[PDB]
Design a protein around this ligand. Structure first.
Ligand SMILES: Nc1nc2c(ncn2[C@@H]2O[C@H](COP(=O)(O)OP(=O)(O)O)[C@@H](O)[C@H]2O)c(=O)[nH]1
Ligand SMILES: Nc1nc2c(ncn2[C@@H]2O[C@H](COP(=O)(O)OP(=O)(O)O)[C@@H](O)[C@H]2O)c(=O)[nH]1
Lengths: 369, 110, 57, 369
């Protein structure tokens, strides 16, 4: 099962270009697409080695970079031009699909803040037409700006089978708090750390989680509550790492309860005190979950690349993600009272309200019905 | 009870359990509580060997009448204790357990 | 059996059968934690099955 | 169990900063809050190491110190400003309380002579509102000064669960008598030694006194009589230390009888002769006790810090402490006849009159009813 990734807009290119650089080094692969001599499953993202990427003036910046041998501002402009090249970019994706053994997903990296917003809205619609059995995960990045942002949310709430939020605001704080930057060339270094460590269980096979649909169906219980946030502590036992992930200082997000937690421990820590920490987290009650359904916390170990110390990443499905929407929803109405049908915006307006209500209904002891 | 720091935490965790009658008490549940106390208090920084022998036993009412530690010892060291020191320590441990709950009651009232 | 069979029902694409699996599977699960608890790890498994205090019946 | 400390006003910050220096040096903790290589239970006052302090100009001189890596004048003016930042400072406390395993109490270091004294009186009431089951011990320090002193007394008599008095007039006389200073940083050396010695049986565990209520439950007979005084002798047999503590020259206080006594012997003394000395001190009748109920004297041993000889501290409950309130009381009346309602001063003046009336009646054979 192979995962063909997409990169749209200046954001998607820059994070993806730095995502591949983090992966190319984590394996024994020279930037010349040649394996270095110097066990790790590398057939998911690389094709025997060439990465399975379909990019879409930053492109020239990549073609001049040493990695050259490895391959307007309106939302309407993005959706319009995307229709004019419907056959062009689908020729590439189709020829890249059948050449692969068995396609599994479409990890799409785009920012909802110019053309990446309108084009990505076009793709996520068109993929569900032709490919109805392919998961579509998206590493969307949060920042007329209120308009282009929410319009993509209309598509991301009914097409994308998963979504990982990464807002530049909360990232900029961690850029200022523990890195003291005051730049895009620095915050993306943290984004590339989150994207690479997200698929560490696919590239390093273990007891479980050997396929993308194994990481998805565990967290996302229902087709609607499909938004996830991340947590990465290393910026020492398993109890030291588990306690730091639950602190609000580490989450990349600016009653409320969790739905499902998955912990990624990339250390060489002994797997005997693992259950002891989970036992302790239950006692001190450092996190609460949904009251209606049985919600449990899962922890997964892996092995660090010898070619490159305990780290940790947490995939979270938290109801407090509804706050980020309200900030978008709020500024929209203000721009709606300040200035061929203008119905798509209002129709998108309604469905976002259905989503936020579903979150605030998820924290109720009677979320069923 | 010469530790004091460990027995303090151990009397706060057995409170919700021992209040029930002895019929609903089963040994397999308390061991997880004892193991939790040895981890939280200062008794964690200790020789792993001696911590392997420290367990619980159930005397044969209320949960405050059948609980007691054992610290079984077998082998060459068992020639110093000889099954009579272990039948005397438990004879002592009751008097130090009672005079310890009769105090944590009187600091709760206060 | 009720887990794998429930996959077959959903694979045939009724409303009175989904709720029929619920009362049948949830009853079978409660028989497990009843026997897994009565012993002298075999006890830490319960902490793995439920984490939110659910199944406290 | 853990104990969170608060430091209010110029005095609280100084004596608290000197309390933490002495407590860090007493343990194996470098000024960089890192454990050096070089048994002592330190989880109560240190967090895994981070002190559980809540500091409230002087802060800058603390931050310019080598210990930076370790974290008007009216009463009404000090009360109001605390009301406007009511929500602010509690967020620091609310996260530290819930971040704590099992909270036990609130140590308060402050001087009642004026923004800090006013802020203290405000916080002492709110802690009774939110947390009903947490002890509040206050290491108050005695000196428009008469006004502020009695107002905070109105709160310290019904809010603070315990209280240890330390008056400057007794400390200043000691510095000129046995230290010959003729400064604030000089007398605080003695205050730090008493504070560090007060919680000695908490950090070095023994058979008894493993919790803050264990020391207080013996001395304070009724919730009204919750004032204590101190005594520190070395400025050697155990009989020598007991006899030197019961002399008036050592007490830090400028008929009457004792209610309860606690002795802290911190040396390497022989612990077999401790029970002998209490047999003979009773015979000479060096102290007169209450006639209504039974009272005795308590001696508790400990161990000095090896990383840094016999010392001694005596916590007593003497009804002669009523005289100190009388001075503030009489000083208030003289200013009241000399110069929106001024009714709070009337209630405070009245309630402290009942406290004094309890003491003078606490020495009679019929204090019962
Ligand atoms: N996190 C992150 N976000 C970026 C970076 N570069 C651009 N963005 C986001 O992308 C948005 C601009 O998109 P834009 O380049 O105009 O899209 P285009 O019109 O297709 O070129 C901004 O709002 C940024 O938030 C980056 O290096 N890191
Ligand atoms: N015991 C003691 N008391 C102090 C010390 N420093 C200040 N004080 C007391 O604090 C009072 C002055 O308070 P001040 O700092 O002016 O209050 P603020 O201006 O509101 O912080 C004086 O009456 C002193 O008795 C100290 O180092 N030790």
């Amino acid at each position: 099962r192979e995962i063909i990734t997409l990169q749209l807009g200046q954001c998607g290119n820059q994070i993806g270009f730095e995502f591949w650089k983090q992966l190319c080094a984590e394996h024994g692969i020279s930037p010349e697409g040649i394996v270095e001599e110097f066990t790790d499953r590398k057939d998911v993202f690389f094709y025997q080695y060439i990465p399975r990427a379909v990019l879409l003036r930053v492109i020239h910046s990549i073609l001049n970079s040493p990695y050259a041998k490895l391959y307007g501002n309106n939302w309407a402009s993005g959706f319009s031009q995307g229709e004019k090249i419907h056959e062009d970019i689908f020729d590439i994706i189709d020829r890249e699909a059948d050449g692969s053994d068995s396609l599994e997903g479409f990890v799409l990296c785009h920012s909802i803040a110019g053309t990446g917003s309108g084009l990505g809205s076009y793709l996520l619609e068109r993929l569900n037409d032709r490919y109805p059995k392919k998961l579509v995960q998206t590493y969307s990045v949060f920042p007329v700006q209120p308009y282009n942002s929410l319009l993509t949310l209309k598509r991301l709430t009914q097409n994308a089978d998963c979504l990982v939020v990464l807002d530049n605001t909360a990232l900029n704080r961690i850029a200022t708090d523990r890195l003291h930057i005051q730049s895009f060339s620095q915050i993306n270094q943290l984004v590339s750390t989150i994207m690479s460590a997200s698929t560490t269980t696919l590239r390093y096979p273990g007891y479980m989680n050997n396929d993308l649909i194994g990481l998805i169906a565990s967290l996302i219980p229902t087709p609607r509550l499909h938004f996830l946030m991340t947590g990465y502590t290393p910026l020492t036992t398993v109890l030291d790492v588990m306690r730091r992930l639950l602190q609000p200082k580490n989450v990349m997000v600016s009653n409320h309860c969790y739905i499902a937690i998955l912990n990624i421990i990339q250390g060489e820590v002994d797997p005997t005190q693992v259950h002891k920490s989970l036992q302790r987290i239950r006692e001190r009650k450092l996190a609460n979950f949904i009251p209606w359904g049985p919600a449990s916390i899962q922890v997964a170990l892996s092995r660090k690349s010898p070619y490159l110390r305990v780290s940790g990443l947490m995939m979270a499905n938290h109801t407090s993600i509804s706050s980020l929407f309200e900030r978008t929803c709020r500024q929209y109405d203000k721009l709606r009272k300040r200035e061929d049908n203008f119905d798509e915006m209002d129709t998108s307006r309604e469905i976002v309200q259905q989503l936020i209500d579903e979150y605030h209904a998820a924290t109720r002891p009677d979320y069923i019905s | 009870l010469g530790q004091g720091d460990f027995i303090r935490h151990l009397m706060d965790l057995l409170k919700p359990e021992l209040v029930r009658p002895a019929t609903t008490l089963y040994q397999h549940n308390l061991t997880g509580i004892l193991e939790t106390a040895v981890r939280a208090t200062n008794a964690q920084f200790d020789s792993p060997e001696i911590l392997r022998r420290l367990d619980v036993r159930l005397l044969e009412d209320t949960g405050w009448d059948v609980f007691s530690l054992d610290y079984h010892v077998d082998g060459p060291i068992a020639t110093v204790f000889t099954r009579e020191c272990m039948s005397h320590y438990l004879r002592v441990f009751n008097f130090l357990w009672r005079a310890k709950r009769m105090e944590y009651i009187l600091t709760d009232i206060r | 059996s009720v887990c794998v069979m429930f996959t077959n029902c959903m694979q045939k694409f009724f409303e009175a059968t989904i709720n029929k699996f619920d009362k049948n599977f949830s009853a079978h699960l409660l028989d497990l934690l009843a026997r897994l608890s009565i012993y002298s790890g075999m006890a830490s498994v319960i902490s793995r099955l439920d984490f939110n205090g659910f199944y406290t019946e």
